[PDB]
Amino acid sequence: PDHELVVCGAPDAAALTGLLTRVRAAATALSRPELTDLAAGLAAAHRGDVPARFAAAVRDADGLVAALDRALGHLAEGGRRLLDAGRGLFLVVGGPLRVGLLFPGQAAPVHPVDTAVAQPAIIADSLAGIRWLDRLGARPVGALGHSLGELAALSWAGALDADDTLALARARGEAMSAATEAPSGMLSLRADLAAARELAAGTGAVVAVDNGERHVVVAGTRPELDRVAEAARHAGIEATPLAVSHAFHSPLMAPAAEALRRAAGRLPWRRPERPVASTVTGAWWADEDPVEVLVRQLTGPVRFREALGLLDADLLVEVGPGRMLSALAEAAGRTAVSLDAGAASAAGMAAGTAALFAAGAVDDATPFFAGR
Ligand SMILES: [Cl-]
């Protein structure tokens, strides 16, 4: 892997200080294979009930020394909690913390693209992510899925098996690409929901995605989006056209409901057994009919702002390809990191697994070192 995961722990903060000091000494000027040994040994020896925890995703020994120095300096001034998702560095004394999951939708990297291809590809990566959390015994407090991601969240929560979920994603991708006729698309506004509704009022365009206080996407035909783009310029609101050929999350997707209602209606749906904050309802999932919810998801808005606000969590882990949702979460002042499931680069796997270990949501990092 291009990044190594280095974890360790101790019974308390004083003991962790002593260990990190020894590890720092042992790490200086190690070659890459030597660092791998040091890391693999630490993961084997520091797993189970590990009261005070450190985890970092590092490119080399000098990155490891830099991480240890930050953690040591933090401990030295009496700090008990350092969570730097953008540097893959996590220190927690006296956790566990509450961790929530984020499942991305399209517009996510596909391991513009045809939505019939992208949807099952993305869901296949998210389902691989779920197999990783399962291999780790991860205990998050709940999940949300943005758009297409609601399907992966529901599969994580036990509402639908992996094979039926992937089959649904294929059928949904096919239905959605079958729906539009007249040129249409999406326009992202750097503005809140009320400002977007003011710009869209009377234009024909509607709110498609409510991401946050500074990010709301509207959808409509091309003449409708041009009216909003004109209004946004006059109001001094920044409007960015999206590279998509369909309105999504608007009434122009209604013709897909027949095909999707059929596909979804044959499946063995179960009640979710874990909490899911829905971006269709903006509420906790509480015994909804999943078919009716998936059908109105075609035409209604993505309620990501509302769903993220429900998910009470100190740290969020994105389980899917790319890092779109972690970027949205950080825009809301939340702490988030992505596993970047399916990527060529191990960067996200290392950083995401480090976050899950330091937060106490997984007890054993050894699966990172298996089958190299
Ligand atoms: Cl394992």
TrEMBL record:
Name by which UniProt lists this protein: DynE8
Species assigned in the record: Micromonospora chersina
